Amino acid sequence: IEATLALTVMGVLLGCGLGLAARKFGVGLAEKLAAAPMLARVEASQCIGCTRCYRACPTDAIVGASGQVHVVLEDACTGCGKCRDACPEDCVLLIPQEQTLDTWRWDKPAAA
Amino acid sequence: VPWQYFTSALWQYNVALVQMLALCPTLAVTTTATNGLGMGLATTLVLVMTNALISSMRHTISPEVRNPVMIGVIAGVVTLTDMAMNAWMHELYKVLGLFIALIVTNCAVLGRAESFCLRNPVIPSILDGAGMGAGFTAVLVVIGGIREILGSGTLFSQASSLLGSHFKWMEITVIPDFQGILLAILPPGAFIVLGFLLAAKRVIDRKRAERRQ
Amino acid sequence: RVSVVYADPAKPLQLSCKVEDGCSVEQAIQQSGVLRCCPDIDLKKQKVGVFGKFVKLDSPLKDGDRIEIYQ
Amino acid sequence: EYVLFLLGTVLVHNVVLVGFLGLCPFMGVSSKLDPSIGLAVATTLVMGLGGASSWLLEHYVLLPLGIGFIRILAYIVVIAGMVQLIEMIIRKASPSLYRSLGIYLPLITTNCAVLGVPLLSVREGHDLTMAVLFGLGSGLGFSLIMIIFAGLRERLALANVPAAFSGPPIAFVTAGLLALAFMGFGGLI
Amino acid sequence: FNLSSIRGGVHPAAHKDLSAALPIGSLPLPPRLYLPLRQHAGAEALPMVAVGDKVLKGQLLAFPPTEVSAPVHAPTSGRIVAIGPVPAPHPSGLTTTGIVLESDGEDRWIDLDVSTDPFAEDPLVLADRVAKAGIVGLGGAIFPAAVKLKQGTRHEIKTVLVNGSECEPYLTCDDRIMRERAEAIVDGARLIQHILRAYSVVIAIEDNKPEALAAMRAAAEHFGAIEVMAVPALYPMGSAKQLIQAVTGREVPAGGRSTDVGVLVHNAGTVYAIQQALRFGRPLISRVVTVSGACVKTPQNLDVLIGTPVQALIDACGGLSGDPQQLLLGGPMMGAVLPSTEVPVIKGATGLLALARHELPNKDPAPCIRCASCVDACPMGLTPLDMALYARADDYDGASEYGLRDCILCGCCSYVCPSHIPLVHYFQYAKGQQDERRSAARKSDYIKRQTEVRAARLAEEEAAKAAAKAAKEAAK
Amino acid sequence: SVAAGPFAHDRSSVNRIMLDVCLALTPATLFGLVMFGWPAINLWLVTCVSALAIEAACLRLLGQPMRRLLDGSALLTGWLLAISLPPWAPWWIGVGGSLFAIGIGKQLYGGIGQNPFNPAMLARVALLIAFPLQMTTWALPHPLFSSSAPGFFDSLAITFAGAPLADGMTGATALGNLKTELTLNRTAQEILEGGFSTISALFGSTPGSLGETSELLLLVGGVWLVLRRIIHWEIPVAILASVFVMATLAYLINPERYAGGLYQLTSGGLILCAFFIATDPVTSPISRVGRLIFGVGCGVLIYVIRTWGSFPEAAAFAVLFMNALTPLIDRYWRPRAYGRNVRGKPLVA
Amino acid sequence: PMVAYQGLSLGLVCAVVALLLLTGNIMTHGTIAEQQMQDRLATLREVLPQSLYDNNPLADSFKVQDAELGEVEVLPARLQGKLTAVVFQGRNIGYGGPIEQMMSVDAQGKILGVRVLTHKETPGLADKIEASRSDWIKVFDGLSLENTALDKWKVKKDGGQFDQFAGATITPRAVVKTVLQGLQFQARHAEQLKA
Numbered sequence A: 001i002e003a004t005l006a007l008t009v010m011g012v013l014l015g016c017g018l019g020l021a022a023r024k025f026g027v028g029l030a031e032k033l034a035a036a037p038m039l040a041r042v043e044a045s046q047c048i049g050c051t052r053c054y055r056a057c058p059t060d061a062i063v064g065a066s067g068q069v070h071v072v073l074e075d076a077c078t079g080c081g082k083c084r085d086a087c088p089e090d091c092v093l094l095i096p097q098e099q100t101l102d103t104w105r106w107d108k109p110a111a112a
Numbered sequence B: 001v002p003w004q005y006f007t008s009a010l011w012q013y014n015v016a017l018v019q020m021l022a023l024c025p026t027l028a029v030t031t032t033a034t035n036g037l038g039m040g041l042a043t044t045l046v047l048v049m050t051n052a053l054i055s056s057m058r059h060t061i062s063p064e065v066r067n068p069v070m071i072g073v074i075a076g077v078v079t080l081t082d083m084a085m086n087a088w089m090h091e092l093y094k095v096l097g098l099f100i101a102l103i104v105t106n107c108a109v110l111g112r113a114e115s116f117c118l119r120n121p122v123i124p125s126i127l128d129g130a131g132m133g134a135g136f137t138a139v140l141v142v143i144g145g146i147r148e149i150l151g152s153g154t155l156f157s158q159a160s161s162l163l164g165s166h167f168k169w170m171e172i173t174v175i176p177d178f179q180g181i182l183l184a185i186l187p188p189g190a191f192i193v194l195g196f197l198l199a200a201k202r203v204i205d206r207k208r209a210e211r212r213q
Numbered sequence C: 001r002v003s004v005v006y007a008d009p010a011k012p013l014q015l016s017c018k019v020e021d022g023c024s025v026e027q028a029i030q031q032s033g034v035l036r037c038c039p040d041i042d043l044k045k046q047k048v049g050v051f052g053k054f055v056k057l058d059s060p061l062k063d064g065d066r067i068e069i070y071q
Numbered sequence D: 001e002y003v004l005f006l007l008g009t010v011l012v013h014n015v016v017l018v019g020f021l022g023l024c025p026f027m028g029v030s031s032k033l034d035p036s037i038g039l040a041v042a043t044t045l046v047m048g049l050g051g052a053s054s055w056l057l058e059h060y061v062l063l064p065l066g067i068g069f070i071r072i073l074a075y076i077v078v079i080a081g082m083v084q085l086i087e088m089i090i091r092k093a094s095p096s097l098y099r100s101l102g103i104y105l106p107l108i109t110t111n112c113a114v115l116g117v118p119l120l121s122v123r124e125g126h127d128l129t130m131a132v133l134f135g136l137g138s139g140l141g142f143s144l145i146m147i148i149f150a151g152l153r154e155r156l157a158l159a160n161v162p163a164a165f166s167g168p169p170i171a172f173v174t175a176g177l178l179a180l181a182f183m184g185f186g187g188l189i
Numbered sequence E: 001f002n003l004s005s006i007r008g009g010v011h012p013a014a015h016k017d018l019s020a021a022l023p024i025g026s027l028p029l030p031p032r033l034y035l036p037l038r039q040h041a042g043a044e045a046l047p048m049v050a051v052g053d054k055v056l057k058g059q060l061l062a063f064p065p066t067e068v069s070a071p072v073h074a075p076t077s078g079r080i081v082a083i084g085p086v087p088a089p090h091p092s093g094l095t096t097t098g099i100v101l102e103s104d105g106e107d108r109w110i111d112l113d114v115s116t117d118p119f120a121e122d123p124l125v126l127a128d129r130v131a132k133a134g135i136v137g138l139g140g141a142i143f144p145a146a147v148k149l150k151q152g153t154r155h156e157i158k159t160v161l162v163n164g165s166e167c168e169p170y171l172t173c174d175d176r177i178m179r180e181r182a183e184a185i186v187d188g189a190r191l192i193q194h195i196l197r198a199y200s201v202v203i204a205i206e207d208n209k210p211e212a213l214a215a216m217r218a219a220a221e222h223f224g225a226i227e228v229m230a231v232p233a234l235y236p237m238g239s240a241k242q243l244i245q246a247v248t249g250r251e252v253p254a255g256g257r258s259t260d261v262g263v264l265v266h267n268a269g270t271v272y273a274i275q276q277a278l279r280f281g282r283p284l285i286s287r288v289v290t291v292s293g294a295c296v297k298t299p300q301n302l303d304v305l306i307g308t309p310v311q312a313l314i315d316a317c318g319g320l321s322g323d324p325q326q327l328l329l330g331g332p333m334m335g336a337v338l339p340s341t342e343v344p345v346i347k348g349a350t351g352l353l354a355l356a357r358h359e360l361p362n363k364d365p366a367p368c369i370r371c372a373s374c375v376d377a378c379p380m381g382l383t384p385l386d387m388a389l390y391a392r393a394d395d396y397d398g399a400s401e402y403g404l405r406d407c408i409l410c411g412c413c414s415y416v417c418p419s420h421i422p423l424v425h426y427f428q429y430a431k432g433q434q435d436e437r438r439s440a441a442r443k444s445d446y447i448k449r450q451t452e453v454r455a456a457r458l459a460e461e462e463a464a465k466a467a468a469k470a471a472k473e474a475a476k
Numbered sequence F: 001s002v003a004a005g006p007f008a009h010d011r012s013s014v015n016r017i018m019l020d021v022c023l024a025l026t027p028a029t030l031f032g033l034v035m036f037g038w039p040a041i042n043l044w045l046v047t048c049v050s051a052l053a054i055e056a057a058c059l060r061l062l063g064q065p066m067r068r069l070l071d072g073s074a075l076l077t078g079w080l081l082a083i084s085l086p087p088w089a090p091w092w093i094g095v096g097g098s099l100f101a102i103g104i105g106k107q108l109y110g111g112i113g114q115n116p117f118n119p120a121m122l123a124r125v126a127l128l129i130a131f132p133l134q135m136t137t138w139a140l141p142h143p144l145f146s147s148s149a150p151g152f153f154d155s156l157a158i159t160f161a162g163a164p165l166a167d168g169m170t171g172a173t174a175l176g177n178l179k180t181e182l183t184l185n186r187t188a189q190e191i192l193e194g195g196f197s198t199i200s201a202l203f204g205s206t207p208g209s210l211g212e213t214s215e216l217l218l219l220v221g222g223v224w225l226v227l228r229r230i231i232h233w234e235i236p237v238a239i240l241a242s243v244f245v246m247a248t249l250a251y252l253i254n255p256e257r258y259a260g261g262l263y264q265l266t267s268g269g270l271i272l273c274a275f276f277i278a279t280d281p282v283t284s285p286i287s288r289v290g291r292l293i294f295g296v297g298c299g300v301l302i303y304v305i306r307t308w309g310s311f312p313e314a315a316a317f318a319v320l321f322m323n324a325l326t327p328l329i330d331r332y333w334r335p336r337a338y339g340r341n342v343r344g345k346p347l348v349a
Numbered sequence G: 001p002m003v004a005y006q007g008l009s010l011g012l013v014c015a016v017v018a019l020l021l022l023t024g025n026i027m028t029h030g031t032i033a034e035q036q037m038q039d040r041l042a043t044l045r046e047v048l049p050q051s052l053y054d055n056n057p058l059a060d061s062f063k064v065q066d067a068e069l070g071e072v073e074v075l076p077a078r079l080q081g082k083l084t085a086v087v088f089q090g091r092n093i094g095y096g097g098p099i100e101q102m103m104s105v106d107a108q109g110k111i112l113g114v115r116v117l118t119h120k121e122t123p124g125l126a127d128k129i130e131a132s133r134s135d136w137i138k139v140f141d142g143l144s145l146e147n148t149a150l151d152k153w154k155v156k157k158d159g160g161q162f163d164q165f166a167g168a169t170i171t172p173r174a175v176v177k178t179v180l181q182g183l184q185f186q187a188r189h190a191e192q193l194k195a
C-alpha cells in the first residue's frame, strides 16, 4: 500500500536528517533556564611577641615582630580565625564590628 | 508502594493546578460539567495507554530523536481515540471538537511521557498516568461545575444525551428559576475562575500546613 | 611612595608618603610627619623595622616598603 | 483583501483570548519582557513555517493518496523535525543568534497553536498563500498579546498585590480582564 | 547675558522676613569648644597638639594627611583638654574624634603670615595659600576649596560664578553677608578670577533679595567684567547644576564636573573666606549662621566661631519661647534633626531652625496614585515614583537605571506629593545600601590584592633564601 | 528612629483631588437627575452607597486601614459608574456594577494605585456583556415635577421590584438610530436631517446615559479641572481632535454614508470619557508624549469602533485597550534626564 | 546511536502506527457516515412530520437556479409519486452576520415549520429565534402568500403583524425577510416545487 510506504519514507528521511545534523553540528525546567562580619582584637597582656599570629595570617592584618611589641591588627581582617589557635596564650579576641559614624546608613521607611 | 504515585498525583502535583500545564482544555471545554468530565476521561485513557506503550518501549528510544518517536506513539493513539469517539460518542465529539484532537500537544501528556515513563517500569507509569488523569478530571469537573452553576444554575446538564442515559442521575438543578450570569460561560469567565481556584488552593494549603504544625 | 606605621596599641596609625628614590628611613619618617602627630616618639630609642625586620635609620628603602615604629 | 484578513486574525480572532491555544508557555514565560519578545519572534517564525509545511504535506501527499485521517500525526511529526533543525542549525552557525531564538525554540515544539492553526486552516480550505497568512497572523496576535501581558505582569510584580493572589492567580485574573477588553473588536472584521 | 529657564522646581514659603532685618550679631566667648577633626569631605585631619598644650587663636591644631583634606585651626586661645570623642552634628547622634578647647578668654591672635600685593603671584602660590587656611566651601557640600581651584586651573575657565542665590526657606545668612560685606566678596571674586585665568565673574542673586542686589551693584560698578544677575526665586536654583543652566544655558554632563562647561561655582561665603585668607592670612575660624523659627524669641544671624555648642546660639537669641517640635541644622528642605543642644557648630552648619508644630506639615502616607506631580517638579528630569518603587522592593540596580545615580536629594519630590510618601527617605536609604555594597566590594578587592602581594613576596624571599643556602652547602 | 526630610509640604492630599473631581461632576449630575426624574436619583444613590459599602468590606477583609475609605476614590468610582448607566435601570444593575468594579477591578489588585485597568469602565463593559437587555433600554427625558414623570412611589416600583415602564417612555438615541437606519438602506443625510438637531443634542435634551447627555456642563467641569491642574490637557485635546479630524475626513470623502464632526462630538459619552474617565491618573502614562499617544489611540479606537464596529459607542473598550497598552508606553517614553541625551548616554561638551 | 538505527526506529513507528490507523479507519468510517446521516435526518425531522413523506428526503435532492437566491437545495417529500412538501434553506444578513435557517413549505404554500440553523446574534437579547427558548419561531405555521398579502410580512416596527424582540428588531426583520423570500421563491418556481 502506498500510504504506509509514503509515511515510512518520511519517517526514515526525517530521522536520518536529524541524526546527520546531531552528528555534525521537561517544559517546567526549560522555562527556568530561559527565565555578620567580625574583626580581631589583641589585648595588652596576652601577647608576648611570639610572632605566631603574623606567621599564620594570609592577610597583612597583624603588624609587628620581635618580643613584647604588642602586635595589633588592621582593617584588613576578615575573621577567618587563622590567628586564634596560633597564639599559645590565646590573645586573639575576635569580636563583631562596632557601629561608627562612617558606617551609618538610613533605615527603610516602615510601611504605607 | 505503587499506590503512592496515584495518591500523590491528585493534589501534591496537580497537572493543571501545580505544574501549570494543560491550560488550553482546562479553559476551553469547561462551560459545562459534562464537557469537563468527558474531556478528563478521554485524557486519562490516552495518558494510561501512552504511558504503558512508552514504558514497554522504554529501552528502544534513541536520545536525540526521542520527541518525534514518542510524539508519534502519542499521536496515533490520539487519532484512534478521535476515530473512536467520532463513531460511537458523536454527541460528545461534536461538543469537544478540536480539543479531542489537540491531546498530542497537551503539555501534561508529553511531560508525563518524558519525565516519568522513560525511567520507571510499566506498572508505576500506568499508576502515574491514572493519577494525573484523575487529578485533571477533578480540576475540570470543579471548574466546569462552578462555571455552569454561575451561568445557568443547573449542574451536570444534558448528561443523558452526552454520557449516556445511565448517567441521568447526575442531572441536578441548583438555584431554580435562575437565568444566570452570561459572563461566566464566556472566555472572560474562565480565567477569573481559574485564578480564584488557584488562590483558594494556596489559602487551603497554608491553613492545612498551619493545622499540621 | 611608602607607608609609615605606628603600632601603638591605644591608637594604631598608618600614613602614606611619597619619598625620593634612594632615600633613608630617617628622612622618610621626617617627611611623613609622624613626629608632629606623636611627640613621644624617640627615633634613637624605639625600634624601627621594615615588614617585621629591625632596620637601620640610614638603610635605603625601595618603593612599596612599610616602615614601622614600635617598642 | 489581505490586510483585513491579517487584522481580523490578530485582533478579532486572537488565538489566545478567544482561541485558547498556546496558553502554557504564554502563562509561563510572560513574567519577564525579554523572554516574551524572544518567544514571540520564535513562535511567529515557527507558526509560519509550520503552516506552509502542513499545507504542502496535506495538498501534495495526504489528499492525493486518500489518507486524510492520518493528517494530525504527520503534521506534528513534520513540525517537530523542523523545529529541531531550526534549533541545531542555529546552535553553531550563529552562536550569538542562539540567545533570542534558539533558547526559546524547544518551548514551542508542541505548543497546541502550531498544531491548532493548521487544523483550523484545513477546515476552511485555505490555499497556500491564505494558509501562510493565517499562520503569520496567528503568530502576530500571539506575540502582541504576550508582549502586552508581559508588560502588565512586570508592572504588577512591583505592586502591593495581596499575598493570597500574588503571582499566577493575579495573572489569570488580569488575562480574563484583558480578554474582556479585547471583546470590543467583535464584528469589526 | 540672558537667563534661561530650568526645568522643574517648587515655591516654598520663604519665611525670610522675620530674621533678615537685624544686622549680624556677635557671641560672647563660650567656656569650651568642641572641634571635630572631620568637618570636611575626604580624609580626616590628624592632631598635632597634646593634652594641656597652650594654643593661640589661629594655631593649626590638625593637619591634612592627604591632598583632599583641610586643616583645623583653633578658634580662640586656650588650653587643650581632650583629643577624644565629641558629639557630632549628625541625625544619628554618634560621637566622632575631636578636640576640646577650653577658652582662656584673652582671645589673642597668632603671628599670622600675611601676604604682600596678592595680585602679583602665580596662581599655584595663591592656591596653596588657600590650602593652608582651611577654606572648605561653606555651601553645604563642604568640599575643600583648594582642590577645586587647583582642578579649575588645569582646564580653561570662561566664567567664575558666585553662588549668592540663597534658596532654602528660613535661611538669610547669605543675604546679610552680601548686604554688609559686598566689597570683600567682590575683592575675593577678583582674586579668584586672577587665580583661574578667566573672562568674567557672573555673581548671581535671587530676585527676592533687593537689598543684597543693590549693595552688590553699588560695590561692583567700577571693576568692569564683574556682573550682577538676578535669577528667579525658585527653590532648586542655588544648586550648581541648575544655576549653571540658568546662567550659561549649558548642562553639566552626567558624571562630570562643572569645569567641563568652563564654569566654576563658589558660595558667597566661601568667596569672602578666600578673600580674608589671601589678603590678611586669617584662617577659617568663624562663619555666619541663621537662628530662626517660631520657637525662637528673636531670629537673627550670628557670627559664630567653629565648635560653639548649639545651646549658646539658642541662648544668645533670647531663648526658646515655647516647645520646639523640631530642631534642624539647615533649611527645612535639606536639614537634619539635631540630637541635642550640646552639639557643636561645624564649618558646614548653615542654620539652627527651631520649628514649632504649626510650621511642620502633618503627613499620613498613602499608596501612590500615579499623579506624576513628581516628574513635573524634579529639577533633574527623573521619574521619582519609579525610583521609589524599585527602592522599596530592594532593587537598587533597577532604581539606578531610573535616575538614582543623578539624584541630588533636593526634596522637590516630597513637597508636591498628594499621598505623602517619604520619597527622599527611600532615595537616601537606597543610596546608603549601594554605598555599603560598594565599600564591601572595595575592601574585598583591597584585601585580595594585599594577600596576593604578601604571598608572592614571601614565596620569592623563601625561594631566594633556599637557593642561597643550597649554593652555600655546595661549596662546603 | 530618626526623621528624614524634607520638613515642608504644599498641603496637597488625595481627598482634595477626589472631592474636586466630584465637585466638577456635580453640575452635569444634577442636570441628569432633574431631567430623568426619581429613578435616576434612586439608581445614583444605590450605586454610590453600594460602592462605599463594598469598599469598606474589602478594606476590612484585607486588613487595610479604614481611613482609606475617606479619600473618596470609591465614591468617585461609584459616581462615574452611576452617571454612565441608563437612567431607569434596576437596582441590581447598579449593585452588581459596583461589586464588579470595587472588588475585582480595584480591591483585588491591592487597592488604590495598584490596579491596571479602569474600574468603572470595567464594570460598565461587564454589565453590557452580561446584561445586554437592561443596558440598552433608554428612557426619554421626563423632567422632575413636570406632570408626566412618574411620582415617588411609582419611581420606587420602577427602580426596585420590576414594574414595567409602560409604553411611550422608551426611545432610541442618536448613534444606534443612525446605524439602524443605515441598515435600512437610508443614506446618512436623510437620517440626520429629520432625526437629529445639534442644538438639542449639545445642550443635553436627548435620551442617553444619566450624565452623558449634556456635553456642555461636562465641558465646563473639564475646563475647571484643567485650570486647577488636576488633569493634563493632552488626553482631552488629543481624543477630541482625533475624533473630529477622522470624522471630518470621512464626511468629506463619502457624505452619504458617514456622519462627522458636530454629530460625533455631541453624541455618546465622548466628552465625559475624554475629560473625567480617560484621565485616570493610575491607568494613564506619566509622560507628555505618552499622554498624547494615549489620547490619539483612544480617539482612533473610539471612532473606528463607532463607525465600522458592532457597538454604537466604544469609549469603555478604547479606554480599557489603552490601559492595557499603558505600561509599554511608560517604559518606552521616559523623560530625558539632566546632562544626558534621549538614549541615556552622558552629554559630550 | 547509529544513523541507521534512528531512521529505522522512526520508520518502524510510523509504519506500525499507520497500519493501526488504517485498520481503525476501515473499521469505523461506515459508522461515522451513518452517524452523520442520522444527524442530518434528525435535523430535517424537526420541521417535517413523518406522515407527510414516504420516500427518503435526502435522496432526491433537487438543485434549482433562480434569479435572486442563486442555487438552492430543495429536498422534496413525495408520498406516492406526488409532491407534498419541500425543504430548503435561506440565508440573510442579520446583526452579527448571516443567519441561515431551514424552511419546509407544503405543496399548497402553507409553512409547516421554520427553524434557525446558524446565527451569531447577541445572547440574551436576540436568542429567541431558537425554538428551544421561545415559541416565536413557531409563528409561521399556517401562513402562506394567500391569507397574508405583501403587507403583513414585516415586523410591527415596519407595519406588519410579526412580533419583535424587546430591544432587538434587526434579527426579526432578517428572519421575516428570509421567510417571505422563500415563499416568493416557491411561488415563482411552479410544478417541480409547487405541484
Ligand SMILES: CCCCCCCCCCCCCCCCCCCC(=O)O[C@H](COC(=O)CCCCCCCCCCCCCC)COP(=O)(O)OCCN
Pocket: B146, B183, B184, B189, B192, B193, B196, B197, B199, B200, B203, D162, D163, D164, D165, F058, F061, F062, F063, F099, F100, F103, F104, F107, F108
Ligand atoms: C450563589 C452564590 C454566588 C456568589 C458569587 C460571588 C461573586 C463575587 C465576584 C467577585 C467580587 C469580590 C471579589 C473578591 C475581593 C477580594 C479582595 C481581597 C480579599 C482577599 O484576597 O482575601 C484573601 C482570601 O482569598 C481567598 O481565600 C480566596 C477564596 C476564593 C474562593 C473561591 C471562589 C471561586 C469562584 C470565583 C467566582 C468568580 C466570578 C467571576 C464572574 C486573604 O487575604 P490575604 O491572604 O492577602 O490576607 C490579608 C489579611 N491577612
Ligand SMILES: CCCCCCCCCCCCO[C@@H]1O[C@H](CO)[C@@H](O[C@H]2O[C@H](CO)[C@@H](O)[C@H](O)[C@H]2O)[C@H](O)[C@H]1O
Pocket: B037, B038, B039, B041, B042, B045, B081, B084, B085, B088, B089, B090, B091, B092, B160, B161, B162, B163, B164, B165
Ligand atoms: C469520553 C468518553 C470516554 C472515552 C472514550 C474513548 C473511546 C470510547 C469508544 C467506545 C465507546 C463506547 O460507548 C458506547 O457507545 C454507545 C453508542 O454505541 C453509547 O450509547 C449511547 O450514547 C449516545 C451518546 O452520544 C446516546 O445519545 C445514545 O442514546 C446511545 O448511542 C454509550 O455511551 C456506550 O455504550
Ligand SMILES: CCCCCCCCCCCCO[C@@H]1O[C@H](CO)[C@@H](O[C@H]2O[C@H](CO)[C@@H](O)[C@H](O)[C@H]2O)[C@H](O)[C@H]1O
Pocket: B175, B176, B177, B178, B179, F050, F053, F095
Ligand atoms: C450592599 C448590597 C446589598 C445587596 C442586598 C441583597 C439582598 C436583597 C434581597 C432582595 C430580596 C430577595 O430577592 C429575591 O427576590 C426574588 C423575588 O423578587 C426571589 O428570587 C427568585 O428569583 C431569583 C432569580 O435570581 C432566584 O434566586 C430564584 O429563582 C428565587 O429566589 C427571592 O425572594 C430573592 O432571591
Ligand SMILES: CCCCCCCCCCCCO[C@@H]1O[C@H](CO)[C@@H](O[C@H]2O[C@H](CO)[C@@H](O)[C@H](O)[C@H]2O)[C@H](O)[C@H]1O
Pocket: F153, F154, F156, F157, F160, F161, F162
Ligand atoms: C432607606 C431604606 C433603604 C432604601 C433602599 C431600599 C428601598 C426599597 C424600597 C422598598 C421597595 C419598593 O417598594 C415598592 O413600594 C411601592 C409603593 O408602595 C409598590 O408600588 C406598587 O404597589 C402598590 C401596592 O401597595 C400599589 O398600590 C402602587 O400603586 C404600585 O406602584 C411597589 O410594588 C414596591 O416595589
Ligand SMILES: CCCCCCCCCCCCO[C@@H]1O[C@H](CO)[C@@H](O[C@H]2O[C@H](CO)[C@@H](O)[C@H](O)[C@H]2O)[C@H](O)[C@H]1O
Pocket: F046, F049, F050, F091, F095, F160, F161, F162
Ligand atoms: C445597597 C443598597 C441595596 C438596595 C437593595 C434594595 C433591594 C430591595 C428589594 C425590594 C424587593 C423587591 O422584591 C419584592 O419582594 C417581594 C416579594 O417577596 C414583593 O414586594 C413586597 O414585599 C416587600 C418585602 O417583602 C416590600 O418591601 C415591598 O414594598 C412589597 O411590594 C415583590 O413582589 C417583589 O418585587
Ligand SMILES: CCCCCCCCCCCCO[C@@H]1O[C@H](CO)[C@@H](O[C@H]2O[C@H](CO)[C@@H](O)[C@H](O)[C@H]2O)[C@H](O)[C@H]1O
Pocket: B179, B180, B181, B183, F090, F092, F096, F097, F099, F100, F126, F127, F130, F159, F160, F161, F162, F163
Ligand atoms: C458580570 C458583571 C456583573 C456582576 C453581576 C453580579 C450579579 C448581579 C445580579 C445578577 C442577577 C441576574 O439575575 C437577576 O436576578 C434578579 C434578582 O436580583 C431578578 O430580579 C427580580 O427580583 C428583583 C428583587 O430581588 C426585582 O427587583 C426584579 O424586578 C425581579 O426581576 C432578575 O430578574 C434577574 O435578571
Ligand SMILES: CCCCCCCCCCCCO[C@@H]1O[C@H](CO)[C@@H](O[C@H]2O[C@H](CO)[C@@H](O)[C@H](O)[C@H]2O)[C@H](O)[C@H]1O
Pocket: F027, F028, F030, F031, F034, F035, F141, F143, F200, F204, F205, F206
Ligand atoms: C446645576 C446645573 C443645572 C441644573 C438644571 C436643572 C434643570 C434642567 C431642566 C432641563 C431638563 C429637562 O428639560 C427638557 O424637558 C423637555 C420637555 O420639557 C425634554 O423634551 C424635549 O425638549 C426639547 C427642547 O429643546 C425638544 O426639542 C425635544 O423634542 C425633547 O427633548 C428635554 O429633553 C429636556 O431637556
Ligand SMILES: CCCCCCCCCCCCO[C@@H]1O[C@H](CO)[C@@H](O[C@H]2O[C@H](CO)[C@@H](O)[C@H](O)[C@H]2O)[C@H](O)[C@H]1O
Pocket: F192, F240, F241, F244, F245, F248, F251, F259, F260, F261, F262, F263
Ligand atoms: C475640536 C478641536 C479640533 C478642531 C479641528 C478643526 C479642523 C478641521 C476644520 C475643518 C472642519 C470642517 O467641518 C465641517 O463643518 C461642517 C459645518 O460647516 C460640519 O457639518 C455639519 O453640517 C452638515 C450640513 O451642513 C451636516 O451634514 C453634518 O452632519 C454637520 O456636522 C462638519 O463637521 C464638517 O463638514
Ligand SMILES: CCCCCCCCCCCCO[C@@H]1O[C@H](CO)[C@@H](O[C@H]2O[C@H](CO)[C@@H](O)[C@H](O)[C@H]2O)[C@H](O)[C@H]1O
Pocket: D004, D007, D186, D187, D188, D189, F304, F307, F308, F309, F310, G095, G096, G097, G098
Ligand atoms: C488598531 C487599529 C485597527 C484599525 C482597524 C480598521 C479596520 C477595520 C475597518 C475596516 C473593516 C470594515 O469591516 C466591514 O464592516 C463590517 C461590520 O461593520 C465587518 O463585519 C461584518 O462581517 C462579519 C463577517 O461576515 C460579521 O461580523 C458581520 O456580518 C459584520 O459585522 C465586515 O467584515 C466588513 O464589511
Ligand SMILES: Cc1cc2nc3c(=O)[nH]c(=O)nc-3n(C[C@H](O)[C@H](O)[C@H](O)COP(=O)(O)O)c2cc1C
Pocket: E136, E137, E138, E139, E140, E141, E142, E143, E145, E148, E163, E164, E165, E166, E167, E168, E236, E237, E238, E239, E240, E241, E265, E266, E267, E268, E270, E334, E408, E409, E410, E411
Ligand atoms: C538642593 C540643593 C540646594 C542648594 N542650595 C544651595 C544654596 O542655596 N547656596 C549655595 O551656595 N549652594 C547650594 N547648593 C550646593 C553647593 O553648595 C553649591 O552648588 C556649590 O557647590 C558651592 O560650592 P562651595 O561649597 O565650594 O562654595 C545646593 C545644593 C543642592 C543639592
Ligand SMILES: Cc1cc2nc3c(=O)[nH]c(=O)nc-3n(C[C@H](O)[C@H](O)[C@H](O)CO)c2cc1C
Pocket: F017, F018, F021, F073, F074, F076, F077, F080, F106, F111, F112, F113, F114, F115, F117, F118, F119, F120, F121, F230, F231, F276, F277, F278, F279, F280, F281, F282, F283
Ligand atoms: C482625574 C481623575 C479621573 C478618574 N477617573 C476614574 C475613572 O474613570 N474610573 C474610576 O473607577 N476611578 C476614576 N478615578 C478615581 C481613581 O483614579 C481610581 O480610584 C483609581 O483607578 C484607583 O484605582 C479618577 C480620579 C481622578 C483624579
Ligand code: SF4
Pocket: A042, A046, A047, A048, A049, A050, A051, A052, A053, A054, A071, A086, A087, A088, A089, A090, A091, A092
Ligand atoms: S600569636 Fe599571640 S602572643 Fe604571639 S605575637 Fe601574636 S598575639 Fe602576641
Ligand code: SF4
Pocket: A039, A040, A056, A057, A058, A059, A061, A062, A073, A076, A077, A078, A079, A080, A081, A082, A083, A084
Ligand atoms: S582573623 Fe584572619 S585576617 Fe583577621 S587577624 Fe586573624 S588571621 Fe588575620
Ligand code: SF4
Pocket: E367, E368, E369, E370, E371, E372, E373, E374, E375, E384, E385, E416, E417, E418, E419, E421
Ligand atoms: S507625587 Fe506621590 S502619588 Fe503622585 S506620582 Fe509621585 S509618588 Fe505617586
Ligand code: SF4
Pocket: E377, E378, E379, E380, E381, E382, E383, E384, E406, E407, E408, E409, E410, E411, E412, E413, E424
Ligand atoms: S530628590 Fe532627586 S529625584 Fe527628587 S526632585 Fe530632587 S533630584 Fe529629582
Ligand code: FES
Pocket: B021, B022, B023, B024, B025, B105, B106, B107, B108, D021, D022, D023, D024, D025, D110, D111, D112
Ligand atoms: S500549551 Fe500546554 S496544553 Fe496547550
